[PDB]
């Protein structure tokens, strides 16, 4: 539990954190979807910026 | 329980010699102590101020500090698997000079004197000491010293 000359660490993992792990595996997919939505909105809203 | 104090088991150690009680002779206070001098530690029972501990009784150490009436001694104490230095301040009374160092200065002076005189001509100074070499050959003469025959004595039951 307590050992040789090591720093003191405050790890906040004592509740059921395993049920609330959010891993962003869809970074590239979300970026592609955002770009497609931007293109669709640009087409829809006319030459307006 | 158990008792391990500052003066435990020193009944025969912190005790004055037979027929040597009373005050201390006025010679210790007249000794001049300087930094680097090697001195021995011997506790005196009459004075109970600045007394050394049981371990530092009989130990030999160098002087590193000079005070009004006290000197500092550095003693190497063996704790565990190492020697640690200990700087302890003791009164002049419980400290005496060491004659081994004085013999060393005397040997050094004779050493330099011989190095001067012998090397004035430059032949076999031999400045180094030697141990007890085996005895050389000798001749004994039996002129009035005829060897006397000796035999074991019979067992006796003297009371």
């Amino acid at each position: 539990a307590i050992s040789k000359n090591l720093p003191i660490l405050k790890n906040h993992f004592r509740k059921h954190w395993q049920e609330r792990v959010k891993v962003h595996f869809d970074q590239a997919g979300k970026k592609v979807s955002r770009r497609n939505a931007r293109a669709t909105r640009a087409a829809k809203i006319a030459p307006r910026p | 329980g158990k008792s391990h104090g500052y003066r435990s088991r020193t009944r025969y150690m912190f005790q004055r010699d037979f027929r040597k009680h009373g005050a201390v002779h006025l010679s210790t206070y007249l000794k001049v102590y300087k930094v680097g001098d090697i001195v021995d530690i011997k506790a005196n029972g009459s004075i109970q101020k600045g007394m050394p501990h049981k371990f530092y009784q009989g130990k030999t150490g160098v002087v590193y500090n000079v005070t009004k009436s006290s000197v500092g001694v550095i003693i190497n104490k063996m704790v565990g698997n190492r020697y640690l230095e200990k700087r302890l301040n003791l009164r002049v009374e419980h400290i005496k000079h060491s004659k081994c160092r004085q013999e060393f200065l005397e040997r050094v002076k004779a050493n330099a004197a011989k190095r001067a005189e012998a090397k004035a001509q430059g032949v076999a100074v031999q400045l180094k000491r030697q141990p007890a070499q085996p005895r050389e050959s000798r001749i004994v003469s039996t002129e009035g010293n005829v060897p006397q025959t000796l035999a074991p004595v019979p067992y006796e039951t003297f009371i």
């Binding site: 000359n5 090591l6 720093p7 003191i8 660490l9 | -």
Partner: protein, 185 residues
């Protein structure tokens, strides 16, 4: 059997050949091994031994440090040799002309030397010019100046940088560091 007075089959404790897989570094190590083996100058042996040093054992040498070393009497016309990396210092303003040979040169330091009037050569060129290390001066950076060595040898009455993550108040400043809350260290 033998009543051994020392450990049997014990290693020398020194690093032979670099632990890295840098092909150019191995080539330089081979060249300096050849030099130190077929010459008599201790400079080659010292350089070969320093070539095996690790990153922590090979601290960077600053141009200000090089100038300070060359400011010594008779060291103006000498070839600086750094077994490692030479960094650039912006706290200095006047850099004298010199000749520094090192493994890797920082871009800023190289520009500073070029502007001053010196040149940046490698260890191979240094060996070619001076096979016996004539008129050379070896420079080593500060090894004990790292932040990881302050925490070494921590103990009471030592003050040896206790291993901490955060700094400020109520972070290892309570009892054990002040006389008002018990003892001081």
């Amino acid at each position: 059997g033998i009543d051994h007075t020392s450990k049997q089959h014990k290693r020398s404790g020194h690093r032979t050949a670099p632990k890295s897989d840098n092909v150019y570094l191995k080539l330089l190590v081979k060249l300096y091994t050849f030099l130190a083996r077929r010459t008599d100058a201790p400079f080659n042996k010292v350089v070969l031994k320093a070539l095996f040093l690790s990153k922590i054992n090979r601290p960077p040498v600053s141009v200000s440090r090089i100038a300070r070393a060359l400011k010594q009497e008779g060291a103006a016309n000498k070839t600086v040799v750094v077994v490692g990396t030479v960094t650039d210092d912006a706290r200095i303003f006047e850099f004298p002309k010199t000749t520094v040979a090192a493994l890797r040169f920082t871009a800023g330091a190289r520009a500073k030397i070029v502007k001053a009037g010196g040149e940046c050569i490698t260890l191979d060129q240094l060996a070619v010019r001076a096979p016996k290390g004539q008129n050379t001066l070896i420079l080593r950076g500060p090894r004990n100046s790292r932040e990881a060595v302050r925490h070494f040898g921590m103990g009471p009455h030592k003050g040896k940088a206790p291993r901490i993550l955060s700094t400020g108040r109520k972070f290892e400043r309570a009892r054990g560091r002040r006389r008002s809350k018990g003892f001081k260290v």
